[PDB]
Design a protein around this ligand. Structure first.
Ligand SMILES: Nc1nc2c(ncn2[C@@H]2O[C@H](COP(=O)(O)OP(=O)(O)NP(=O)(O)O)[C@@H](O)[C@H]2O)c(=O)[nH]1
Ligand SMILES: [Mg+2]
Lengths: 113, 166
């Protein structure tokens, strides 16, 4: 469904390749959106950090703004608890950029500085 | 330095993330944030030897149970955690232990049984019950509290030492 484990594994493998490509200090994120009904926007994010560390974050919002807020909160939490700071990031949606993937990426890149 | 791959598994809410965060950051989380998969790395000195502990915090919820096979194949040591104030979580340990046993294809898998939340007085799993379970598994049993840091270092370093005996 919206929490497909095979999907998750594909996102993690992609994010591993991304981390292997770009320099180590840059965090690599892969985000996907499921538009369950209209008040059930669910966001899945896979994050790879510098010192070979990883985390998976979810958000259940009704608008893209709430989803982005929860995403950024999880990002900051997983930075602080691993004793790391934000160097740079890169967000991709591997295959189907669709109903709300592009808008979520625009909001995520907006909430950066 | 020597690298030890530890995997923290158990039922949801028993405090796997709290224990791992207490070990890594010396901080206790009072918020329940359900986990899917988290990776941490920590440089420690155990018995005079410099180790890199690669700790993998797993998801205790019934969802994301298809990801068990991969990490139960990769990890070397396993912290099986239950909550002393959660009888069902204690009853859930056997399923994780059997999954690890069948995936590893070995009865001798480095494991430590961990009774978390020992700071709480609403105890429904007595120490001797978990001791009997651990004796059946032939593994150590340690009580820990992520709130007070009690037993956290003991549990993790005992898991490392159990890995050492292989
Ligand atoms: N009193 C007490 N509370 C604890 C202890 N460890 C964890 N908790 C409480 O238990 C709550 C849930 O802990 P958590 O680490 O998220 O459990 P979890 O195993 O990671 N759940 P999940 O598998 O779904 O991710 C925390 O918010 C915290 O308040 C402990 O040793 N003592
Ligand atoms: Mg957790």
């Amino acid at each position: 469904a919206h929490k497909n484990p095979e999907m998750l594994e594909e996102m993690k493998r992609e994010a591993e390749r991304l981390k292997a490509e770009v320099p180590e200090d840059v965090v690599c994120v892969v985000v996907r959106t499921t538009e369950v009904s209209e008040k059930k926007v669910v966001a899945t994010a896979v994050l790879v950090f510098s010192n070979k560390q990883r985390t998976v974050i979810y958000a259940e919002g009704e608008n893209i703004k709430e989803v982005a807020d929860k995403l950024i909160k999880g990002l900051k939490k997983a930075l602080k608890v691993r004793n790391q700071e934000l160097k740079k990031v890169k967000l991709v949606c591997p295959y189907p950029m669709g109903p709300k993937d592009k808008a979520l990426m625009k909001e995520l890149k907006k909430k950066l500085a | 330095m020597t690298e030890y791959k530890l995997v923290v598994v158990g039922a949801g809410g028993v405090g796997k993330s709290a224990l791992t965060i207490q070990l890594i950051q010396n901080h206790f989380v009072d918020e329940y944030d359900p986990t899917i998969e988290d990776s941490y790395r920590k440089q420690v000195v155990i018995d005079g030897e410099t180790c890199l502990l690669d700790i993998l915090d797993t998801a205790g919820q019934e969802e994301y149970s298809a990801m068990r096979d991969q990490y139960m194949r990769t990890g070397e040591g396993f912290l099986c955690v239950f909550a002393i104030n959660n009888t069902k979580s204690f009853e859930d340990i056997h399923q994780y232990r059997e999954q690890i046993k069948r995936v590893k294809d070995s009865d001798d898998v480095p494991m430590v049984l961990v009774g978390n939340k020992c700071d709480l007085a609403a105890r429904t799993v007595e120490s001797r019950q978990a001791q009997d379970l651990a004796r059946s598994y032939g593994i150590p049993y340690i009580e820990t509290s992520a709130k007070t840091r009690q037993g956290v270092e003991d549990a993790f370093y005992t898991l490392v030492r159990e890995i050492r005996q292989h």
